[PDB]
């Protein structure tokens, strides 16, 4: 009931003029609307279809005819094109780049555009390959879809292409790839908010209409149609406010058309944008529409339609009934309320049937009068926003309403994307927490790819990211498996089949990630990796529910094509079969046979049906069924329509498959391994677990836990495993010993280890001698048949003879395997025979030392008293030098030699030496035992001692619980002796009631002397053990002597400049920025594994940081390339006085380290001279007060001077002259410390294992 006059006549588009020339439009119409129907011939018609545009242009300046006979040729065209199809599904896709399409057609374009510009080239490329007459959407011509600024996640349809003859649709996807890295860069801009800026445009003709003499206004509408987007996009908000002020000035009634202006302002302000910017589309929808509505004909009724027929009262009528139901304005704003809140589940009903049933009638009112052809256009078009504004508040409650879909989209973004793999102990709590809220395979094994990124990360050192991730990881694991085990004690099969496998890789991993060999997994091969787990996260959706994250949907597209880029021979057997099945298939539905047709009908039914990896052979068997009722049709009849050729390249491949199956037979002992390994990773798996991470929630648990522990261990006999378990208690203790939510639990595992570890050796020789004989017969038994020369029939009766040979060796090696590994954990009586001090004289490893020990004053004028660096380190060199200069182990050797040399002294005969010699033998052997241990009681180790022996003696398992590791080959070596020595002292001690055969109270002698030299060991090795934690601290505190700690940024970038270089580099004229890319990223990473020459090092690599930061600068500038684009994006993002007092300090700590170094010498010179000259324990307490020199007291001096040095600015003219003139000698007390700890360390060593060897020969005399 209003205006709507001089808007068809300045809106007022192009239109037909004649009657003819409605002909000519309708008839072109449905002419190019049937060509745009259904690659290379893409191109040539999207010529076709632009010529034809750039004629109907021309023919539209009125001068008929010429189109007439070539449009005629253009038909002749179009229905040779008429003679060729298009099936597909879920290509939908194709209608987003269509969307993009028309809103960088409308939104990029103020100027009158008749399709000329290469716009029109992307539109109609899009538009004959699109969805959906074709020349009433060019009907808006010389004049002025919609949810994909919503939600691109159907995207994952795309890779659900893929999923489920393909190969058209596997080109198709290469197209549809093509011609998205076509519509790259206006889908790079923003979406979302160019809408913004089109409803800005739009509501600038209509206001600008609303005037018609307006000068200032006029050029407020000049600069309000200002064709530069940025610059507009700029002015967004003063142009709304100006014009909300310029459209106060005009007539009553307007304000729908200003509250528009209201929502519209903060809608390019504001995540809420969505519910802004439709509550202001359905308000200057309604504004104009109401402006533009008369309740009667108000026509502009030249250059209109060649009609005396006027019904457009008739289509006023319709127009008005849906006129009619926004007439009244309570639906629309009804529905506009709904769209603010409160919305339970009935306006999603409501609003999709005002969608669908608005949409019906806006098709009808184009379809029916093609009348009111200018009229029908600007209402339809305002209804059009309208509609938009409806669905968008519709997306957007039903997103607030319910959001168990956004979850799925906020892990799907992450699981795929390089936002994702760009770098989270609180995110993996996050995204852990959120799969909890997340048919269970592929939530494992997101579980599994989150992991694996995990210890790719780890790489670039920390305990605290890694250990709870994993421990949080490995608590999901662990309650699915019992959850599976539970449910097993009541495809299922198939899915604790994946839920096996998976638990294999994970523990496999787990074995992996702290063993540390060499932990690399190709960053593309994680992506890619991560592709396959996006599309199996694809077929775990069967909704597109999930909504755009809206932050990247361009590269991720390029994601499918680097999946579809870079248990598989079945597609090729099966293609050679497939063609020769429709081969012999057309001449049999030609020929009819009735029998034999219905065998190659099923035969290719069945042949074509599974498409499994892991199930092969049953192809084979379906192959092998072809060959019969293909042999047996041939031997039939038909000499003549017999196909018969790829009948002999069937028999050739089955042929080389039976081959395959003859070498592939080959490995079977590997089956059975990794059989045993997957029922037995789980036991132990959950044992060990259980008892090793309940810790997330002492001296006496402890022991409790390694009494289970060894008892498992032990209690693991069936040999085999011990080599496998023995790795994998050496890698959970490493993978939860890092945590710090234990600390004693990781000297439990690793010295369950090391003194499990005695017995290995001789396990792994049984191993490998059992797998010789396997082997040998297997070499034999697949020996036995070869190239057989004969038997298409007799093939599977071989296979079975071979099939019964093969179940008898694995009968055989399941036997072997099975056998209990109690067995050789012992030890016998074997006679066998058994690196002072090192340095680092290191003047040359400073040597700027020596310049400033030629040169300066201004530190001479300060007195350090030292006054020769040099000859102070000639003094330390000088001190190990004189004090280079074991008992226990020289009269353990001196008693062995004796022992040896008496053992065949007296080899000889019973009854003839029973004469005379055996008397004074068997009266000298019971002698050598009298003085051994009577000059042993001298020598240390008195008898009939207890006081601390009740502690050792018993629980030989809680007894190695006690006995504290050290920090960080030499250190493997003094272990697996002295733990081998404790593993023979709980059965020696164990040993008593059958010493008389050997033939008493001695013995009790000799087993107290025995705890008593394990006690003296195992205190030098407390003693050990924290010189070793100190001298660990100590060289930590050293270690930490213009660009730092930015690192974490650089090592970003440079994870940043990887991911997007594998991206980039899945470009399929485009590689030369590829590679070089890559050179940059390499040497930030470098730089990082680096973190004087150094000093040259950093400044390369801030100047690399610039040089990256440009080099990426001018591609992006001078290239679209979008990814790189956005990848630029965020990497811009990302880019962009007390002299005395500490010199006191310093010299009082060196000189206390000089003293201390004295202190030593006059130590151990003592425990020198009192080598022979004590009884084992005077020498001994010696010994341990020479490495009781002072370490921890230096540490904390030394953490002194580094607090007061770090928080002080570094002056290299005063500061560094002292620091050069004194770190070096810290260096070098570092280095004589490790020395002395090596020297000591293999003095107990060796004075532990002789004894130890004196133990067996104690308990070899006790065997006889």
């Known amino acids: 009931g209003l205006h709507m006059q001089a808007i068809w006549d300045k809106w007022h588009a192009f239109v037909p003029r004649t009657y003819d020339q409605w002909s000519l439009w309708n008839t072109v119409d449905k002419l190019l609307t049937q060509y745009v129907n259904a690659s290379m011939e893409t191109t040539a018609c999207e010529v076709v279809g632009t010529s034809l545009s750039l004629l109907n242009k ?52 103020t100027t009158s555009s008749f399709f000329l510009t290469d716009d029109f080239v992307r539109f109609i490329r899009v538009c004959f390959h699109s969805r959906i007459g074709n020349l009433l959407t060019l009907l808006h011509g010389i004049s002025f879809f919609d949810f994909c600024s919503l939600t691109t996640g159907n995207i994952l349809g795309r890779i659900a292409l893929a999923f489920t003859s393909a190969n058209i649709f596997e080109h198709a996807r290469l197209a549809l790839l093509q011609h998205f890295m076509d519509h790259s860069s206006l889908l790079a801009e923003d979406s979302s908010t160019k809408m913004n800026l089109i409803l800005l445009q739009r509501y600038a003709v209509i206001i600008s209409i609303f005037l ?35 459209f106060l000035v005009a007539n009553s009634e307007f304000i729908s058309y200003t509250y528009t202006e209201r929502f519209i302002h903060s809608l390019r302000f504001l995540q809420k944008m969505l519910k802004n910017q439709g509550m202001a589309y359905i308000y200057f929808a309604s504004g104009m529409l109401l402006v533009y509505v008369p309740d009667k004909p108000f026509d502009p009724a030249s250059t ?44 999603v009903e409501e609003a999709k049937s005002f969608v669908t049933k608005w949409k019906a009638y806006i098709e009808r009112i184009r379809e029916a009068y093609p009348q009111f052809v200018d009229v029908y256009e600007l209402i339809l078009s305002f209804i059009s926003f309208m509609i938009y504004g409806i669905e968008l508040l519709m997306f957007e409650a039903k997103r607030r309403l319910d959001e168990r879909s956004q979850i799925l989209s906020t892990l799907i973004l992450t699981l795929v994307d390089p936002s994702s793999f760009a770098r989270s102990f609180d995110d993996v709590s996050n995204l852990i927490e959120q799969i909890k809220v997340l048919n269970d395979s592929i939530r494992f094994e997101i579980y599994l790819f989150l992991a694996s990124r995990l210890c790719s990360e780890k790489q670039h050192s920390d305990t605290h990211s890694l250990a709870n991730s994993f421990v949080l990881l490995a608590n999901e ?98 293609d050679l079969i497939k063609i020769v099945e429709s081969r012999a298939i057309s001449l049999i539905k030609n020929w009819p046979e009735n029998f034999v047709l219905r065998g190659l009908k099923d035969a290719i039914d069945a042949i074509l049906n599974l498409s499994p990896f892991s199930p092969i052979a049953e192809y084979l068997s379906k192959l092998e069924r072809v060959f019969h009722l293909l042999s047996e049709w041939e031997k039939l009849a038909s000499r003549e329509y017999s196909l018969a050729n790829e009948m002999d390249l069937i028999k050739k491949k089955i042929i080389d498959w039976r081959k395959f199956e003859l070498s592939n037979w080959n490995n079977l002992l590997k089956l059975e391994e990794y059989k045993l390994s997957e029922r037995v990773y789980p036991r132990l798996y959950s044992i060990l677990q259980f008892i090793i991470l309940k810790p997330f929630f002492f001296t006496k648990q402890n022991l409790c836990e390694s009494a289970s522990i ?74 036995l048949m070869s190239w057989k020369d004969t038997n298409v029939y007799a093939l599977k009766e071989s296979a079975k003879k071979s099939h019964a040979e093969l179940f008898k060796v694995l009968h055989r090696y399941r036997e072997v395997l099975r056998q209990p590994v109690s067995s050789y954990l012992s030890q016998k009586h074997d006679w066998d025979s058994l690196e002072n001090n090192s340095a680092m004289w290191v003047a040359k490893k400073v040597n700027l030392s020596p310049s400033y020990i030629e040169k300066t004053e201004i530190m001479k004028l300060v007195p350090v008293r030292f006054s020769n660096t040099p000859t102070t380190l000639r003094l330390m060199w000088t001190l190990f030098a004189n004090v280079e200069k074991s008992t226990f182990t020289n009269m353990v050797s001196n008693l062995i030699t004796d022992a040896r040399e008496l053992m065949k002294l007296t080899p000889e005969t019973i009854n003839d030496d029973n004469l005379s010699e055996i008397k004074h033998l068997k009266s000298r052997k019971h002698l050598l035992l009298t003085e051994t241990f009577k000059t042993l009681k001298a020598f240390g180790l008195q008898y009939r001692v207890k006081a601390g022996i009740e502690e050792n003696l018993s629980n030989l398992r809680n007894l190695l619980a006690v006995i504290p590791t050290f920090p960080v080959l030499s250190i493997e070596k003094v272990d697996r002796s002295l733990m081998k020595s404790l593993d023979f002292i709980p059965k020696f001690q164990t040993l008593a009631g059958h010493q008389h055969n050997d033939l008493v109270p001695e013995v009790q002698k000799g087993v107290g002397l025995f705890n008593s030299m394990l006690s003296l060991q195992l205190g030098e090795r407390a003693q050990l053990v924290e010189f070793t ?120 700590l060196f000189d206390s380290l000089l003293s201390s170094i004295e202190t030593a010498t006059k130590n151990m010179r003592t425990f020198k001279e009192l080598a022979e000259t004590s009884s084992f324990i005077e020498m001994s307490s010696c010994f341990s007060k020479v490495l009781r020199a002072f370490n921890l007291k230096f540490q904390s001096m030394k953490l002194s001077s580094l607090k007061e040095k770090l928080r002080s600015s570094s002056v290299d003219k005063m500061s560094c002259q002292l620091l050069m003139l004194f770190l070096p000698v810290c260096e070098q007390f570092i280095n004589l410390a490790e020395s002395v700890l090596d020297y000591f360390i293999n003095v107990h060593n060796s004075n532990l294992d002789s004894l130890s060897k004196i133990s067996t020969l104690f308990f070899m005399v006790a065997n006889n």
């Open 304 to 347: 209109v339609y060649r009609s005396l027929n006027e019904s457009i009262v008739p289509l006023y009528s319709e127009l008005e009934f849906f006129m009619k139901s926004v007439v009244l304005n309570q639906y629309i704003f009804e529905l506009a309320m709904r769209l603010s809140k409160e919305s339970n589940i009935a306006v």
């Open 710 to 783: 060894i008892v498992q261990f032990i209690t693991d006999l069936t040999v085999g495993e011990f080599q496998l378990c023995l790795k994998c208690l050496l890698s959970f203790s490493q993978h939860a010993a890092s945590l710090r939510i234990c600390h004693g639990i990781d000297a439990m595992l690793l010295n369950i280890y090391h003194y499990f570890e005695q017995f290995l050796s001789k396990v792994s020789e049984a191993i490998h001698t059992q797998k010789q004989s396997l082997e040998n017969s297997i070499k034999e038994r697949i020996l």
């Open 212 to 246: 018609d003499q307006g000068k200032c206004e006029k050029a407020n509408d000049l600069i309000t149609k200002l064709s530069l987007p940025y610059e507009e996009l700029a002015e967004n908000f003063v142009s709304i406010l100006e014009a909300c002020k310029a």
């Open 1029 to 1148: 934690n100190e001298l660990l601290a100590l060289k930590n505190v050293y270690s930490e002597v213009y660009d730092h700690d930015f690192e974490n940024r650089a090592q970003a970038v440079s994870m940043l400049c990887q991911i997007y270089a594998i991206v980039i580099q899945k470009h399929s004229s485009f590689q030369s920025i590829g590679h070089e890319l890559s050179r940059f990223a390499d040497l930030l990473s470098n730089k990082l594994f680096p973190s004087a020459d150094k000093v040259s090092s950093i400044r390369d690599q801030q100047k690399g940081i610039n040089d990256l930061i440009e080099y990426c600068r001018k591609k992006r500038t001078e290239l679209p390339e979008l990814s790189y684009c956005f990848k630029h994006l965020v990497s811009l993002q990302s880019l962009k006085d007390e002299f005395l007092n500490l010199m006191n300090f310093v010299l009082n």
């Open 58 to 109: 021309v023919l539209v300046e009125n001068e008929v005819g010429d189109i007439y006979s070539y449009l005629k040729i253009l038909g002749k065209g179009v229905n040779e094109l008429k003679s060729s199809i298009l099936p597909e599904n879920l290509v939908n896709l194709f209608n987003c780049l269509a969307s993009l399409d028309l809103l960088h057609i409308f939104i990029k374009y």
């Open 477 to 574: 694991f662990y309650i699915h498996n019992a959850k599976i085990k539970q449910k097993e004690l009541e495809e299922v099969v198939i899915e604790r089949k994946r839920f096996l496998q998976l638990q294999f890789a994970f523990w496999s991993l787990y074995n992996e990630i702290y063993s540390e060999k060499m932990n690399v997994i190709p960053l593309e091969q994680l992506m890619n990796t991560g592709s396959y787990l996006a599309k199996k996260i694809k077929v775990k959706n069967p909704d597109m529910i999930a909504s755009s994250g809206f932050d990247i949907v361009s590269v991720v597209l390029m994601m499918g094509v680097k999946s579809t880029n870079e248990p598989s021979k079945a597609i090729e057997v099966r």
